[PDB]
C-alpha cells in the first residue's frame, strides 16, 4: 500500500511531516507501518531537520 | 566431529528413537565396513551409497516400527566403548559378549573389522569399537 519510492532525507519536508504528529512528535513504526530500516532512517532524518529548524521541537 | 565412529552410531541411535526408517550418514572405510557388518548381523534393513560434490553418503533403511509407533517393546541400542579418551583393548580370553550373545560386539583386529564370533573362531583379540543390542 503506502510506500517510499523517493529518496528520504531531511529536506523532503512533505514526507517527514506525514510521519510527524500534530505536536511534532515522531510516530511509532507500528502506526506508520514501515519496515524497521525505513523507520530508523525517518527518525534520524526528523532529528536532523529539527536541528536545522526545518521542523520544530515544540510548537508556537 | 572429534570422533567419527561415535557420530555414525549416534545418528543411528537418534534416527531410531524418532521412528524414522531412513538415515543419512557420512561414509568412510570404517563406516562402510561397520554398516556391512550391521547388515550381515541383521540389525538394519538395507544400505546404499550416494555422491555429490565429492561427498559420500550411506543411507540406511531401518527395521520397521514394532506393530505401531506408540506400543514399542523393543528399541535398538548402541554404545561407544573405546573412545579417544580411553581406548579399550582385550585379549582373546576377555573378548566381550553381549547379553549372553543376543547382541554383538564390534572389534577392530589385525585381520580387519569383525564381530566377537569371528574373533573367537580365528583366536584374535583387538580394539573394541562398540556394543550393539
Amino acid at each position: 500500500p503506502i510506500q517510499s519510492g523517493d529518496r528520504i532525507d531531511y529536506r523532503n519536508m512533505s514526507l517527514i511531516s506525514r510521519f510527524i504528529s500534530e505536536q511534532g512528535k515522531i510516530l511509532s513504526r507500528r502506526v506508520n507501518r514501515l519496515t524497521l530500516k525505513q523507520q530508523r532512517l525517518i527518525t534520524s532524518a526528523i532529528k536532523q531537520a529539527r536541528i536545522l529548524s526545518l521542523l520544530p521541537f515544540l510548537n508556537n | 566431529g572429534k570422533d567419527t565412529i561415535a557420530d555414525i552410531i549416534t545418528c543411528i541411535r537418534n534416527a531410531d528413537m524418532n521412528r524414522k526408517g531412513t538415515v543419512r550418514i557420512v561414509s568412510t572405510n570404517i563406516t562402510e565396513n561397520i554398516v556391512k557388518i550391521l547388515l550381515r548381523e541383521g540389525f538394519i534393513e538395507n544400505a546404499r551409497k550416494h555422491q555429490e560434490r565429492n561427498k559420500y553418503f550411506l543411507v540406511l533403511t531401518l527395521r520397521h516400527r514394532r506393530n505401531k509407533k506408540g506400543p514399542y517393546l523393543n528399541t535398538f541400542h548402541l554404545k561407544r566403548v573405546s573412545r579417544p579418551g580411553l581406548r579399550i583393548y582385550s585379549n582373546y580370553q576377555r573378548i566381550p559378549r553381549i547379553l549372553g550373545g543376543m547382541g554383538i560386539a564390534i572389534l577392530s583386529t589385525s585381520r580387519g573389522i569383525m564381530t566377537d564370533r569371528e574373533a573367537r573362531l580365528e583366536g584374535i583379540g583387538g580394539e573394541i569399537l562398540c556394543y550393539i543390542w
Binding site: 519496515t35 525505513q38 532512517l41 536532523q48 529539527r50 536541528i51 536545522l52 529548524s53 521542523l55 520544530p56 | -
Partner: protein
C-alpha cells in the same frame, strides 16, 4: 554523473542571517568554495535556497557583541567531494563566522531500502 577517485561524498547545509545582500552572500559563497577547493575538493557544486521562516527563533552573538534574534534564514546547500581528512576544519570555519548562524554537514550514503 558524479565519480569520486579516493574521496568522500558530502552534503552541507548552512543557515545565514536574513539581513544579508546578494553580494555579501556571493562573497561567502566564493570564500567557502575556495576553502573546499584548497582542501582537495574535486567537484564543488553549490546551490542556494534563501529566506525561509525558521521552525524556531535562533540566537547568534557577533564579534561586535550583538545579540541577533532571527526568524527567517538563508539556506545554502553543498554537494562536494573532499578527503575525509580535510572535512575537519571546514565545520569549525563555518561555526566561527558571524554570518553563519546554523551549520550542519552530512555524509551521503547510497540509499538501498
Amino acid at each position: 554523473p558524479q565519480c569520486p577517485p579516493g574521496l568522500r561524498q558530502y552534503e552541507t547545509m548552512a543557515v545565514l542571517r536574513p539581513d544579508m545582500t546578494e553580494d555579501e552572500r556571493l562573497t561567502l559563497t566564493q570564500k567557502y568554495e575556495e576553502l573546499l577547493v584548497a582542501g582537495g575538493a574535486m567537484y564543488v557544486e553549490v546551490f542556494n535556497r534563501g529566506v525561509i521562516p525558521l521552525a524556531y527563533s535562533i540566537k547568534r552573538k557577533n564579534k561586535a557583541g550583538e545579540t541577533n534574534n532571527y526568524l527567517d534564514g538563508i539556506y545554502l546547500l553543498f554537494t562536494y567531494f573532499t578527503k575525509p581528512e580535510s572535512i575537519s576544519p571546514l565545520e569549525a570555519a563555518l561555526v566561527t563566522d558571524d554570518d553563519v548562524i546554523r551549520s550542519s554537514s552530512f555524509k551521503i550514503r547510497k540509499r538501498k531500502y
